[PDB]
Design a protein around this nucleic acid. Structure first.
Length: 155
DNA sequence: GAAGGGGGGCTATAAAAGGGGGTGGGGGCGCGTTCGTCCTCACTCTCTTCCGCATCGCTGATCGAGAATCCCGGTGCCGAGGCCGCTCAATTGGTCGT
């Protein structure tokens, strides 16, 4: 996390409660959009320091997350990839991945190119799995993502 | 007109002077064959935009078929026209007691 990032007390409390010890605890953090939930997610990734997967409910959110990661973290643009049907960044070429539940949770036949990344995603283990707007997660298709992706801790 | 004869100019030679034109020298330029270029165009060959199917949030609408009514069988009641049993009440009378 670049020192430009400013962390508010409630944000710090939520992170301290999530990182009660040297081991990250899985669970849900409820913060308003104006409260900078994105920064907490980025901070958690910077804390875990391991390969992480961010999933948004829309392509607009995926764009927002990319901007926020660049805005708040030392990570370079090439190190971030937005695995999406509409756009390609050679996800296998970098460690940080961003996508959507509609893509990974997709029930119908995958495109040959998207299948390449998904198999790489399936085989790799994710240290942190950030889920945005998790109120949608209990959906029958979206919850499948949790069985498809292998993640050590999910926030 | 036929033709020959005479006078004068040309021709050369030297020399100087100062000046203009006659000449060929180098020259600029336009013209023009030659050529490819930059270029339009009309063929058309790739990046791109975008239509498609399933899913979400939340609700309504259709749906079959278990079930609110409708309906089968019992209660009884009182409806109905039998009828009898029997009583009472209406009638007569006399009797006679209170």
């Amino acid at each position: 996390l670049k020192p430009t990032a400013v962390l508010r007390p409630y944000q710090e409390k939520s992170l301290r409660k999530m990182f009660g010890n040297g081991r990250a605890r899985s669970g849900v953090i409820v913060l308003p959009c104006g409260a900078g939930k994105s920064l907490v997610g980025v901070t958690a990734a910077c804390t875990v320091r391991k390969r992480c997967l961010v999933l948004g409910n829309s392509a607009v959110s995926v764009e927002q997350w990319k901007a926020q990661f660049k805005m708040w973290s030392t990570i370079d643009d090439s190190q971030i990839c937005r695995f999406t049907s509409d756009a390609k960044d050679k996800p296998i070429g970098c460690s940080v991945a961003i996508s959507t539940y509609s893509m990974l949770g997709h029930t119908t036949k995958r495109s040959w190119e998207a299948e390449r990344v998904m198999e790489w995603l399936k085989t790799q283990e994710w240290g942190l799995m950030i889920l945005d707007e998790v109120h949608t997660i209990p959906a029958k298709m979206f919850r499948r993502v949790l069985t498809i992706v292998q993640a050590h801790c999910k926030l």
